Write a protein that binds this ligand. Structure first.
Ligand SMILES: Nc1ccn([C@@H]2O[C@H](COP(=O)(O)OP(=O)(O)OP(=O)(O)O)[C@@H](O)[C@H]2O)c(=O)n1
Ligand SMILES: [Mg+2]
Length: 212
């Protein structure tokens, strides 16, 4: 039915784009489909959903969901800062570009000089800090998303378990796939439609909120 009737949810989705100039930019391959799916499931279950979307070209805005379109990592951060205080749940599913062009050309660049890169702020960490400082009373649950690959140093779960504690979020969605909770619970995420996966994620949020 409607688990999320009283829940104000803030969802980010898609990838950000950091401009070199008006024409070109630095981006990633994020579709934002998973975040959109989570947005729809939440709204279907009675949540008041605000969705902040990055590069989602062919996706259609979900009905019953307040849409806030942004372009870059900075624009995303400012959007979150604006809408977070009213949110009970923050679903950080956007693929934020780690690096940004240090200087942006006013006009399209016409061998060229190298591009200087500067690190972007950790928007999630900003939210986690704000709640820790008592500046987010309404916030009850914070969800992070991560893509992990096995390397010589460790397993996928090995890296996933580490990132969950580093980010300081309550739940981490890892892509098969995993749902990692801060209490120490681990649930497998079987390959399926983005809809079914969204249901699993929202179920974890619901289950978490009951414990809150
Ligand atoms: N600048 C950033 C980068 C990440 N994220 C959020 O943090 C979570 C972790 O994403 P990930 O890129 O895997 O974490 P990183 O800190 O960037 O780790 P890594 O350097 O391995 O990519 C994601 O939900 C993402 O939305 C964020 O808010 N701000
Ligand atoms: Mg990153």
């Amino acid at each position: 039915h409607h688990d999320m009737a009283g829940v104000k949810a803030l969802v980010t989705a898609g990838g950000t784009r950091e401009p070199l100039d008006p024409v070109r930019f630095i981006g990633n391959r994020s579709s934002g489909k998973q975040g959109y799916a989570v947005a729809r499931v939440l709204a279907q279950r009675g949540a008041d959903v605000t969705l902040i979307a990055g590069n989602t070209a062919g996706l259609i805005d979900p009905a019953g969901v307040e849409m806030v379109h942004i372009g870059s990592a900075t624009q995303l951060r400012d959007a979150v800062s604006k809408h977070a205080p009213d949110a009970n749940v923050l679903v950080m599913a956007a693929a934020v570009a780690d690096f940004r062009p240090a200087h942006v050309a006013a006009a399209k660049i016409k061998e060229p000089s190298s591009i200087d890169l500067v690190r972007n702020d950790d928007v999630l960490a900003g939210a986690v800090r704000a709640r820790a400082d008592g500046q987010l009373p309404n916030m009850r649950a914070i969800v992070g998303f991560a893509a992990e690959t096995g390397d010589a140093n460790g397993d996928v779960l090995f890296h996933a378990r580490a990132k969950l504690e580093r980010k300081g979020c309550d739940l981490l969605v890892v892509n098969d796939g995993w749902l990692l909770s801060a209490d120490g619970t681990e649930s497998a995420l079987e390959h399926g439609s983005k809809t079914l996966m969204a249901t699993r994620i929202v179920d974890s949020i619901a289950a978490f909120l009951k414990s809150q």
